[PDB]
């Protein structure tokens, strides 16, 4: 079915729910004081040790749409992932890493996608000591979306750009949206060549103003 | 004004310490156990309460190059920042936010740069449930830097691009680097207008491969 | 629109509850142990995080008669105040400060009235090493009310003192009550000049025996 | 010998020390963690149990100028006082109470002055739900001294007012200071009658501005 | 009525219940984990702070047959007693002291009877280092009653010994029971003179075998 | 064999230390914080686990004069005793019991003398609900020694009572001291038979006033 | 009379529960958190103190089939065993020891079978520094049973091997199973002499593949 | 270089050290409290986080003879192992597992030998509910060695049994030792066939008495 399991619970998992559908969601956590918070956010709760194979099963890891792992240490996170893989070799796994050196480990454990927020943060700290416009960008487009947002956008099964090359698409100058890359199953091509051409299903990874995104959305189908 | 003060301690601030000279660095924290780790990474350690004005003072917040604030809760981060502002009204302050709602408040308290690692981490989760091209872009360029990298590159007091427009300079088509924004004295102009004109001192924010970046360094110099 | 919200729970807020109706009081606190204490004091209890905006919203901060903030540290107190302001710019906020240096900060955050019991206590301690008449005054009119009280008394919509000079009114002679100040429109003129003229809505701040206070209430009326 | 012993440690006693000498003060507390705080404030530390009679002896309670008692509970405070009286029946004891019901008890145990910060606080909170002119006066006279200040001023061995009645002295009109009482050896007479005549070593308790207070001192001189 | 209140809870209060009637008994304690234990032992439980006057009232201290105090520190025990006295000047109070130096304190607080088990123990330890028959006696007559017990026995309103002197009673040699003392309201006379004479109501404090106690019981009435 | 080992620490063992030379004394305990108190009372402190044979060994349990065992639970007391018996089969062991049911077990583990302070304390409570003559006897002679006292008095290698019977010696009627028992080599004969005959070395256990005891010392000597 | 009692809860006792019926198992533990873990393993839960005799009584220790004792320290384990013996002299006790030195002590207390997993583990660790065939044998027949198992197999009331010599029986040749020992009446003869004769009720202790074990069961029968 | 690193500390690793040298052993643990224990056992202590790659480096994992991993959770153990393999891909790693499901996982992470004390334990508990001959054998051969012992014995560079079949060697009848397998470089052949012929450096795994073992060594010599 369409359900999602979340292991552990923190401010990032709380944020993750703002964007998700509560019925859909099962939070698996060791500590009970988390139950009220999880329920208030409109998700289901499961009391269990998320490093225990039988408890991961209990929380419906098997048919799940995706599993999100964020435990209190990299040690527990890895271990959770090892567990999940024993239950389902092919379920999509998203996992938060703490220490840079364990990004690798989570990936050889089974994480399909890793996130290192404490490493991004730690580096934006050092680059920003004198000014750091990089930090401004991250904060104002990834975090707050105060003027511009980054977006994944599908070329529909309609047309307009079907078969058309990026050079002939001239998206930046037609839309106002910068293209960062094109996603086609399992690989993101960043800065795609003039000659690379589009098909229905491809995801465009862009940056633009809300009105610019509306132009882009319009100019891809019909 | 060459020393940097860090308030509190975590993997963020550890990563922070990695890429800047730990000899200019003073870490101020309540917890004794943190001392060992801090000295081990080549910084000095001041034992004190970062919410206490007299403790901020004694840790040389005064004419410091920058103060990095990352405490165990937003409450204490905010308080700490208010404390630093009574000591020095103009010192550069960088600060980590946990909760979205408290970004605004760190800013109002007097933070020059806010970082939101959990807000970012949480968006990337819910965005990554099926695809997560956005997430792999962020992982691979802001965290791991496996192929491409994000750079703030200064236009040197030297020559080539002074006066020349973003349209005329054609930076991407010349150099390979996708240009995301130009930064000038506190502001970042993202996707600048064609007729924008480069001045010396400007910071170019862009994404490229290390040798694409190299070509950009040259192109832009005297 | 007359319910009161109290954030946090201490002997202070217990005492505050003596003089309040109790059914119309809502105490918001993180710690579940507070529930029985609150219910025994005859007030209502909301379990939530008073630093979290949405929890403040749910405790009915908006358009409450007043909010009393007394958290476990000044950091949390300040933070809670910032939260309340976000929900309601105008609601009356009364707040307890621990450290002298945070008195100003609570005000900047938005507190309409700050109270510094430990600063008061500490000054009385140093001043009382040898004799401390000052201490026993405070103790016996602000705390125990053993013989005298301090009161705020409004000049009724009625008359008698309308237009009348403070010299001409002879309030201390007629009434026994030492006038300390007159308050109007949130300015407290302490020890007003002889020529200061009374009007309706003015609040007399005085010290008196309970009989002297009856007396002040008849003198001021009709 | 005029050294001062303080039992326990808190923002209260921190503020106390502000006005005291420091090289003359001995803080007695059970917690080793308090030591750094007490030294950083210019006082001497004694590691002991302030409820233990022999530890109290070790802290030189015997000949002391005064002992200030402020422990973590009324229980402990009461106990510590009982301890002191067993060692010295006539040493000056100043002690902070938390709960109201225990004021009498600190007294019975032997406290010469009791102080109720939380009771004062809770009072001012509930009285401030609308206007708070009272609270305003307290903050700005006992705590902040932003405008006026309280004062004890002895009637010197000397002259001017010896045998002069309060009516004749006319202190408010000469000085601008509001008399609130006369301390007459353990006695505080509040709002003294007009035919009360000042004698040797009476202590006047007043409220006034810095220059009003300076004027009082001259007017009462030799 | 006939109810008894117990403050605090320990192995000695558990033992005390072996001999008491459960309905009769109210245990007042701060900590909930004690509730199941108290209920299992057949007593009633009250959740409350036994140093709080209002909670002592809540637990029915007022009309109680007796109140037994055994808190975790002498500080809390004394304080409890001070509280109880404010509620009922004449209720019988039995209290456990920890430190020898506080035996006095509990008594001037209001305890009608004090028990110092840690002092008795500590001394029997030192006296028993080489042999200590004293310890054997305490342990085998006060604790285990393995062969002999110590007993309080009332001379009934019957007769036999009514008016008779202890010399003429020859109790030791008639009964086998050693007399340690005679209790008559408020005072125990130890080693009563040959001439002292008996009346109905007097309690005999003895030591004997079960059969010896039976002879004594017999030989006092009818 | 002149040193004494104490296992664990409490007010019991503090009282114990009071009346014997702290220079012969080694205290063994898990808790670091206990060190300060122990040195302060003139004993040495060994930091170790009293349930661990190698730790008992290293604390000189071997040929010690006696070992006093008072640990935080009966479980550990019992274990500790078993541990000491593997090291020395015949060293004198004195031990504190908390629970009645565990007296038997400390004994079976190998304790020469058991002490039950809570069992005793608990009996005295329920016995003291109305009268408590028993309790005041125990308080006043085993704890406080306000008038009478309990004494173990040795019959010296000297003279007077050798061979003489308890009937002939008439100790009480001669001396004032109530005689409770005679102790001979591991046993205590309480209320000995008339024809019992005193031998040198016997210990008389009795209750008297200090000068009644003095008369007994003389009467019994050479 | 076939219920089993388990004192304490650990991965050990979880594992033990695999091979037991579960409905007939009662786990006694102090910590309420254990309840959910037990109920998930399909066993019943009693909340009590397994060191307290009356709690053991209430968990039905008396006449249970066996009691398994696995507490958090050897002290508690020993103590619990002593408790059980007091209730039932004959019930089978199986116990887990942590420290080598306590193996003997658990037996003295009354354990019918002791198990030392950490002693076993520690020996295998030191012995395995270089190659450890011994380790992989243990791992693969005592733990994982990946290829072979160890079994106890009874000589049926039937016959075939009745009276037959172990040399004459050729068990290893016929059956594939290495015989290690024969047990009768709680003596285990390991590696019996050639001339040792089998009888009914004897238990063969062997190592074999599951097919070799089927084989042993037919050979031994009929 | 043949120093041994141990990660973590417990009764396991204490027993390990029993048979190891000690001046060659380095224990790596996070807890400062472990230091005293590790020194009192003749080993060296390193204060570090055994899950931190750089701390592992600091402990000289690089060239080590072997590393023993035994942390407080399987999570940590797995993580520590992943750490070691990143530093050294071929160093001998021996690791203790708690839960069964994690045996494979320690292996996948890189453990050369895994040990399951709790799984072994739980097995022997449930199999011992009636007879426990199995458990008896384990205790008295792997732990206590009260009677027999296990052994690995290499077939020396020398002679006697080179190319000799197990049938011809007839080891049980010559020696009295039960052969259980032959180790042949990473291979453990259990119950080897009769026409298996011993070659160079094979390791025989057997059970026997001290003198049976001594006989095996002679019989297999040069």
UniProtKB/Swiss-Prot annotation, chains A, B, C, D, E, F, G, H:
Source organism of this protein record: Methanothermobacter thermautotrophicus (strain ATCC 29096 / DSM 1053 / JCM 10044 / NBRC 100330 / Delta H) (Methanobacterium thermoautotrophicum)
Annotated RCK N-terminal domain residues: 1-116
Places the protein is found: Cell membrane
GO molecular function, one term: identical protein binding
The protein, known as: Calcium-gated potassium channel MthK
Keywords: Calcium, Cell membrane, Ion channel, Ion transport, Membrane, Metal-binding, Potassium, Potassium transport, Transmembrane, Transmembrane helix, Transport
Any one GO BP annotation for this protein: potassium ion transport
Coverage span on the entire protein: 115 to 336 of 336
Residues engaged in binding Ca(2+): 70, 96, 98
Further comment found in the protein's record: It is not known whether calcium is the physiological ligand.
UniProt GO cellular component terms: plasma membrane
Domain notes for this protein: The channel is composed of 4 repeated units, each containing a transmembrane pore part and a gating ring part. The gating ring is composed of eight identical RCK (Regulators of K conductance) domains, in an alternating arrangement of one domain from each of the four subunits and four from the intracellular solution. Two protein interfaces between dimers of RCK domains from the pore-forming subunit and from the intracellular solution hold the ring together. One is called the fixed interface and the other the flexible interface. The flexible interface forms a cleft where calcium binds.
Protein function: Calcium-gated potassium channel.
Limits of the RCK C-terminal domain: 138-222
Record note on quaternary structure: Homotetramer.
Its membrane topology: Multi-pass membrane protein
């Amino acid at each position: 079915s369409r359900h999602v399991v979340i292991c552990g619970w923190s401010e990032s998992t709380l944020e993750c729910l703002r964007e998700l559908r509560g019925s859909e969601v099962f939070v698996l956590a060791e500590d009970e004081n988390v139950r009220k918070k999880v329920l208030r956010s409109g998700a289901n709760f499961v009391h269990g040790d998320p490093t225990r194979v039988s408890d991961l099963e209990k929380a419906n890891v098997r048919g799940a749409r995706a599993v999100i792992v964020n435990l209190e240490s990299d040690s527990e996170t890895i271990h959770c992932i090892l567990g999940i893989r024993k239950i389902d070799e092919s379920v999509r796994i998203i996992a938060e890493a703490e220490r840079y050196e364990n990004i690798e480990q989570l990936r050889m454990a089974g994480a399909d996608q890793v996130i290192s927020p404490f490493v991004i943060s730690g580096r934006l700290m050092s680059r920003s000591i004198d000014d750091g416009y990089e930090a401004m960008f991250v904060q104002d487009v990834l975090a707050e979306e105060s003027t511009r947002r980054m977006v994944e956008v599908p070329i529909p099964e309609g047309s307009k750009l079907e078969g058309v090359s990026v050079l002939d698409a001239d998206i930046h100058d037609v839309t106002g949206v910068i293209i960062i890359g094109v996603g086609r199953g399992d690989e993101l091509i960043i800065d795609p060549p003039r000659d690379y051409s589009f098909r229905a299903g491809d995801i465009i990874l862009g940056i633009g103003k809300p009105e610019e995104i509306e132009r882009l959305k319009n100019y891809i189908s019909a």
